[PDB]
Amino acid sequence: SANNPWTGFQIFLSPYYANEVAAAAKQITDPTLSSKAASVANIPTFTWLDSVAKIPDLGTYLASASALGKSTGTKQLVQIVIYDLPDRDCAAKASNGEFSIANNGQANYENYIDQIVAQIQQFPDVRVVAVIEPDSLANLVTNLNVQKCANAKTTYLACVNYALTNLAKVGVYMYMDAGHAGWLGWPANLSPAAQLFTQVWQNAGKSPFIKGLATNVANYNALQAASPDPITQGNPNYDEIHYINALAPLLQQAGWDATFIVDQGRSGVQNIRQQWGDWCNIKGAGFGTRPTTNTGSQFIDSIVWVKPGGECDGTSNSSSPRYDSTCSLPDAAQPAPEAGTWFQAYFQTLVSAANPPL
């Protein structure tokens, strides 16, 4: 729509990623590559609120952003991911999520949202953009035959609804996670996906703060591929622009003037996967197009970096109880540490293979 949340705003740079990057860059031995690595701390990323323990940091980021804006005469914008559903990651082998449906998951998740809202409420001069619950709704489209997902459906819908409804009250601009071209972009998945997203939008009152959808989060697809990646055979929507061009009109037709954001943080190198479903620490990935509202599409508000490159997707150690065997595949960089922890060699390659170059 006419209101692109990023226009006229300075994005607050994640202090946590900045510290990870600074520690990483000092370990890189080549001076030029080290300088390029250090500059990554100046590229805006999303901060993942993957547990209640992250909420105090959110409060500090909002207050820091408010003061930076006043000091520089700018309006500041903080980028967050809401990522703490009960029975999170229902189609994965295991999950690190602190809440379970069986132990008051709904109420605990609502309290997590309430704590986030209570922070955001205190800093009305800071804009907030939130990606809502990566993987969750996409799993409800294609993975209902996973019994954990089938059993989680009502909780996921109620929790996502609670998040949308209550974050809207503090004016947060929200993009529901919507998988990627190889997940929901298959032509046959577009209508079931559109029907689900539209129902979620309706249940949350069609708030204008529910801007649309986020795609490619934590994935590696091109926004606009020079030629189709071989993993995409059978799907005419072989990149994110094809997916979004196909899905956006279905949402519009339902009355939702929906726009999109697209993760490109690990999309600099294409044609690095054996299978489209391979998602874990894909070897040879490079940093991709840096965040910008110059997206080339009427449907896309911004290219963004949602998943922070260098933070691991999962361990390759089969003895870990958090182990997911996708993290031991051939196209997966190994050995790899636990999910979320820093993967230094992977970061160094992300820097070295960045496209455009850093």
Residue numbers in the entry: 82 to 439
Give sentences copied directly from the paper behind this entry.
Two major conformations of the loops are known, an ‘open’ conformation that makes the subsites more accessible and a ‘closed’ conformation for arrangement of the catalytic site residues into the catalytically competent configuration. As shown in Fig. 4(a), the N- and C-terminal loops of the PcCel6A apo structure were both modelled as double conformations with similar occupancies ranging from 0.46 to 0.54. In §3.2, the loops of PcCel6A remained open in the absence of bound ligand, but occupation of the substrate-binding sites induced conformational change of the loops, resulting in a narrowing of the active-site cleft. In the C-terminal loop region, on the other hand, the r.m.s.d. values between the apo and cellobiose-bound structures were similar to that between the two conformations of the apo structure.
Cellobiohydrolases (EC 3.2.1.91), which hydrolyze cellulose to cellobiose (a β-1,4-linked d-glucose dimer), are key members of their enzyme cocktails, playing a major role in the hydrolysis of crystalline cellulose. The final structures included residues 82–439.
